[PDB]
Structures are given as structure tokens and as C-alpha cells.
Design goal:
It is classed as protein fibril. Keywords: ParM, filaments, cytoskeleton, protein fibril. It forms a dimeric assembly. Averaged strand structure of a 15-stranded ParM filament from Clostridium botulinum. 2 copies of one chain form a homodimer. In chain A, strands 11, 12, 13, 14, 17 and 18 form a 6-stranded mixed β-sheet that branches. A 5-stranded mixed β-sheet of chain A has the order 3-2-1-7-10, with helices on both faces. The first copy, chain A, folds into 2 domains: about 160 residues, Nucleotidyltransferase, domain 5 (2-Layer Sandwich), CATH 3.30.420.40; about 160 residues, Nucleotidyltransferase, domain 5. The first copy, chain A, contains 11 helices and 18 strands. Chain A is of the alpha+beta class. Chains A and B meet through strand 13 of A and helix 1 and helix 8 of B.
Chain lengths: ~350, ~350
């Protein structure tokens, strides 16, 4: 019969997912060793399962391990360190996160003969170099998940011809605007997508041909490795210790709490770093202006709409506007641009 | 056995070619340093190889270099500058372009003992002065081409008695109309071909003798050096910067896009120069009227059919009509007049 569709993202910041039925999940990419949650169940009921993902994951040898994963793992003091996390796409940390995003997006009582076409992503520079790693790992993927405290398990095993690879930010403007940008694309124009990710910033462009079809410009588009939201969290971590003059250091929860607001509540008091937050965000925005113009010479004039996406684009939209003011806009769902783009352009097959 | 036939043109605007089997190619005369195309292969398939000519060219020392050549090189921002391109016929830029036109016109699985008679051209004033340059260079020509992304290679090496030189615009009306103009040539008449090329405009005539055979009039025919389509692109480039009043300047892609339409899409807006386009095309047409009458005194009355050809003749046919209205016509394939003329009049041998 027909095979199901689930679009997932493998972003180091936060795993983003959506299914065929437009139910979507989002949670930070943090795991920890799960332990038995029974006492805290009595105090506060788990209304939202996304907040409290305790999970059990089997394998082919049925060697289960518990995992605090996602939002609950951020509350744990022994979690994955997440600021020097492994960059390997075949890591067990990526294995658990991939299982969890599949766990929340398979609805109840699907037919077991009906499989799932899953659509994933790689960074745009790494889509050729690191292709066969995730291509073989998803072939190697054979587990069975178990949700503690909610008592529903899912079987997770994929053959070939179910998995599907598209680059990061590719289908976000290849599809998802293809019905809408027909009035906006004209001829010999350029559209631009700037995904401000956590570790790596994506810059991807497309040329509109004479036949009013998009086509890709690999010499006008690249992935900025080492430039992204992580440079803010790495800088403001140093800015806190220098403001402390004690050697005290925020943990992984306090640090990710910091650069959403800039005002951590530290030792009965707010330690204010609001000046260094606005300063470092312009510092990141400057290193996306000047790197866009490295790929874009006088070609910058020929654009018609620079879209931006990613989680970081939402918090930088005013500062990042000055690449091309009053032309550039914001995509509709800044996190789920890669998700919906993998969904619709994954529905081609 | 029988030796194959390929007719090529060496026009600075766009290389025009045709084979013995009437398969013909056309691409602009732009090269650039080729790089590895693998990521863009995944996005959009190369259906037409003429659009996406990535190529590898060996030599006698097997020193290969990659080349983005033709339409793809126009999309590159580091290409051959093409507005001050070298006029040398023995340049490496001419070497690569000559190899590429031979690459697309040798069909699959020809016998290696069967060679190819290639027919080229020189400008009509330069056919005597610059004869031995291309005559020796094609003797010096020894390479082996490799098409990336399509995986077919061709061996390219020519001895003497395969190469063949005819002037530009010569065989276009010497042959290619010789079967058809029998009803139109009478006696002591003049036929005229005006090739509006990119850099140089060709004016070539023929006298019909008493024996109803064509014969050449070198004092009634010359090549207009410095007059041609390039004077439009050089003028409208100045017209854009003067309309901008910013110092901004179009690149090689935007400039060649301009004077096919006159309306470049510049910084979210159309910068209109439609008035200066119609004005400069009459300015070029005036400098072909007055230069034709420099060679043609009261001899102008004795014509019977002024043909025009070249790429520029197609876009100037209405303005250039006023040399001799309602006598003058347009050749059938305005680009391939030199190509088919080199083909049939190259089939004499
Ligand atoms: N409301 C917010 N306030 C501050 N930062 C945010 C907010 N939402 C998202 N972010 C930042 O955006 C990042 C998420 O980026 P994301 O689009 O998931 O890219 P990736 O695919 O690389 O993980 C987070 O690391 C976070 O720092
Ligand atoms: N559709 C078109 N619109 C505008 N200009 C054109 C068009 N087709 C051809 N041309 C012009 O004609 C030139 C091609 O001339 P061509 O016949 O190749 O002469 P040459 O042998 O000197 O290269 C191009 O440089 C271009 O400017
Ligand atoms: Mg991303
Ligand atoms: Mg010509």
C-alpha cells in the first residue's frame, strides 16, 4: 500500500520534525542517561510529552538503554555536553535523537505493511562528502522505541528506497514557495535563503532561467562552517566569567537560558549582560554580511527576495536586514523551513 | 576511407558549428576555469549538454585543465572578460573554444582511420594577412578532449590536407544559394552579403559574369573593423552608469542580457534604457549605410538582392533595410550562414 511520510531535521541546535499529517515536533538536541521517573509523576502530570521525553530504545540484540532526551535532558546536570558535541552523523547521540523524532511522529495504529518514507538532510557542503554515511546508517537503522510513562512503542527499521536525502535549505525555497513565488520570479533573477543555524550558517541561492524554472548555483552558495548561533553562546560564556571575576561558570541550562534574554538570575541577583548580547549579535550579523558578499560580487544587485530562515534568523532579522534592506523578508515558520521543505519536496516521490 | 566533415566558425561573439550530418551547435565564446560539478548535478539534471559544458582538455604532454566554457562560463563571475578579449587566433582561449566545437560535433563511434575535414574561417581582410597563423596552429593542434558528467572523450589531432580555409561570408552566398539564385542572377549584376558580426561587420559582394558565374570584387568589398554589435554593448554600458549616477556597473552576464531586451532588473527594480537601445541601433545602422556607400558609388543601383546575415542582422533587419528597401532580404539561418556556407562549399573537396 501507500508508504507514510515523515520529514526530520538533524540540526545540532534542536531537532525539527514534521509528518505527512502536519503534526510537528521540536526539542533541543540533548540526551542524557534516563532513570526511573515515578515520584515526579505523582507531583505534576506529564501533559505535554515533548517536555518530558523519557524513553527506552531497543536494538537488534534487544539491549535497551533508558534515555532522558530533549527538554528533560536539559534539566539534567549530567547530560550531553552539547557545546563540544560530536560532529559525526553516525554517532549514538544522533542515533537516539533520530529515534525520538521518529517516535513522536508515527501516529497510532498505522498498518505495518505501510512503511514510511523519511526525508532527512545534510549540510550543503557536506551533502556530497558525507552522503554515504547517513545513507548506510539509515540502512543500518533497526531499533524499537519505548515511551516510558505513556506506554506506546513503535517499531523503527528502514530498508532502502524509503530513505531520501536532500541538502539543508534546498527544498525550503525549491518547494514551499514554488506555488507562491510564481508572481515574484521573473527571469535571470536570484532568490536567496540564509539559514542561521546553530553551528553552521547556510547560504543557498537559485537562478531563475529563461523557462522560469529554478536552477542551482554552487559557486554562488556555500555553508559557513564555524559561523552561526554557537558563536554567541561561546562568547557570552566568556563574557559571564569576565563579569563574574570569580571563576564561576554557567552550566548548559543557564547558558542556553542566557542568550534568549541576556539576564541570568545568578546568586540571588540578576547578572546583566544585555550590552554584550546586542554587541555580539551585530558581530555575528557582520560575519554574515561580509561572507555573503564573498560569494556575491555585483551579483547582489540581481536579487529579488532574500529569504532568511533557521532559529537564529528569527532573533537576528532586524540586524541581518542590512544585507539588502526592504527587499529581504522572513520565512513563515523560521524553524520548520527545512522541515516543510523536506515534506513537500519529499512528496514528489 | 572517406573523411568526415565539420564546419566551425571562430566568431568572437558566439562559436557556430555544424557537421556533415547537419547537427549544429551554438554557444557564446566565453571560457572560465572549470571546477568540480557534483552538488549541482543532484539538483537539476544536465538535459542539454550545450548549456552546461564542463570539459577537460589534454595535450601532447597530457597536462589537462578543466574549463567552464560557453553558456556555463557566462554564469561564472571569474570568466574571460570578453569585451577586451585577445584578438590573436592562436590564443589558448581560441584553442579551448576550437576543441569544444569539435567535441560536440564528432558523433559516437566514428572509425578512427576516417579523419575529419574541418572548414574554418578568417575575416575577409585578414584571410591573406593572418592565413599562416591558423594554417600552422591547426597543424600544431593535438589534444584529447574529455566531457565531464557525460563520460565521452574525443581524440582531436589534424594533419595537413584535412584543414581548409575560406573567408568569412564567402561560401554563404557562393554556395548555399548557388542552386537557388539561378533564377535571380542574370548578367552583370551584383549580389551583396552584409554579415553584422560582433566585433567586425563583413561586406562582401560578387559579380555575375557573362557566363552567369559569380566572381569576386575585392575593391567593392571589405570588412568593417571596429563596427559591429560590440559598439552597442560598449555604448549601453556607458548608458547604464550614466543613468545610475552611482558608479555601479553591470557584469558580463547583465550586459549581454541588456541589449537583447533593454530592461535589466537592477536592485529590486527595472532600470529602463529602452530609448537608448533603439537610438544606438540606428546609430550602428547608420554606420553600415554610410560605409556600404563608401565602397559602392553608383554601383549600388546594379544590385539585385542584398542579403544580410550574422546574429546582428536578425536584430537590425528593419533598421538595416534602408540601404536598399524592398530589394534586400534576410538569409534563412542568420547565425549559421557562415556555418552552412563552410559546409557545402567545403563539400567541394
Ligand atoms: N526564541 C529564541 N531566542 C533565542 N534564540 C533562539 C530562539 N529560538 C531559536 N533560537 C536559536 O536558534 C537555534 C536553532 O536553530 P535551528 O533552526 O534549529 O538550526 P539547526 O538546524 O542548526 O539546529 C538555537 O540554538 C537557538 O540559539
Ligand atoms: N536574439 C538576439 N538578441 C540580441 N542580440 C543577438 C541575438 N542573437 C544574436 N545577437 C547578437 O549577435 C551577435 C552574434 O553574432 P555572430 O553571427 O555570432 O557573429 P560573429 O561571427 O562575429 O560572432 C551576438 O554578440 C549578439 O549580440
Ligand atoms: Mg538548520
Ligand atoms: Mg561572423
Amino acid at each position: 500500500m501507500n508508504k507514510y511520510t515523515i520529514a526530520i531535521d538533524l540540526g545540532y541546535g534542536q531537532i525539527k520534525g514534521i509528518n505527512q499529517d502536519n503534526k510537528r515536533v521540536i526539542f533541543p538536541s540533548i540526551i542524557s542517561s534516563g532513570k526511573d521517573r515515578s515520584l515526579d509523576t505523582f507531583f505534576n502530570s506529564i501533559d505535554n510529552i515533548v517536555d518530558n521525553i523519557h524513553v527506552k530504545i531497543l536494538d537488534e540484540y534487544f539491549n535497551e538503554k533508558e534515555y532522558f532526551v530533549g527538554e528533560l535532558a536539559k534539566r539534567q546536570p549530567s547530560n550531553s555536553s552539547f557545546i563540544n558535541r560530536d560532529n559525526k552523523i553516525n554517532s549514538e547521540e544522533n542515533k537516539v535523537l533520530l529515534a525520538t523524532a521518529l517516535g513522536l511522529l508515527i501516529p497510532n495504529d498505522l498498518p505495518n505493511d505501510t512503511k514510511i518514507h523519511i526525508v532527512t538532510g545534510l549540510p550543503l557542503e557536506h551533502f556530497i562528502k558525507q552522503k554515504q554515511a547517513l545513507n548506510d546508517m539509515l540502512k543500518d537503522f533497526e531499533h524499537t522505541i519505548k515511551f516510558v510513562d505513556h506506554n506506546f512503542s513503535r517499531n523503527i527499521k528502514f530498508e532502502e528506497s524509503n530513505i531520501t536525502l536532500f541538502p539543508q535549505g534546498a527544498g525550503a525555497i525549491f518547494s514551499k514557495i514554488n506555488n507562491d513565488i510564481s508572481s515574484l520570479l521573473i527571469k535571470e533573477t536570484f532568490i536567496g535563503l540564509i539559514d542561521v543555524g546553530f553551528k553552521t550558517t547556510d547560504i543557498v541561492v537559485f537562478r531563475i532561467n529563461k523557462d522560469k524554472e529554478p536552477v542551482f548555483e554552487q559557486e554562488m552558495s556555500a555553508t559557513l562552517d564555524g559561523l552561526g548561533m554557537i558563536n554567541i553562546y561561546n562568547t557570552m560564556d566568556k563574557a559571564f566569567t569576565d563579569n563574574s571575576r570569580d571563576g564561576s561558570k554557567l552550566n548548559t541550562e543557564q547558558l542556553m537560558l542566557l542568550c534568549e534574554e541576556g539576564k541570568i538570575f545568578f546568586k540571588g541577583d540578576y547578572i546583566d549582560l544585555k550590552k554584550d548580547l546586542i554587541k555580539a549579535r551585530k558581530t555575528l550579523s557582520t560575519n554574515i554580511i561580509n561572507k555573503a558578499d564573498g560569494l556575491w560580487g555585483s551579483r547582489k544587485n540581481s536579487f529579488n527576495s532574500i529569504m532568511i530562515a533557521g532559529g537564529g534568523g528569527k532573533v537576528l532579522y532586524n540586524h541581518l536586514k542590512l544585507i539588502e534592506p526592504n527587499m529581504c523578508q522572513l520565512i513563515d515558520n523560521p524553524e520548520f523551513a527545512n522541515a516543510i521543505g523536506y515534506l513537500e519536496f519529499g512528496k514528489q516521490f
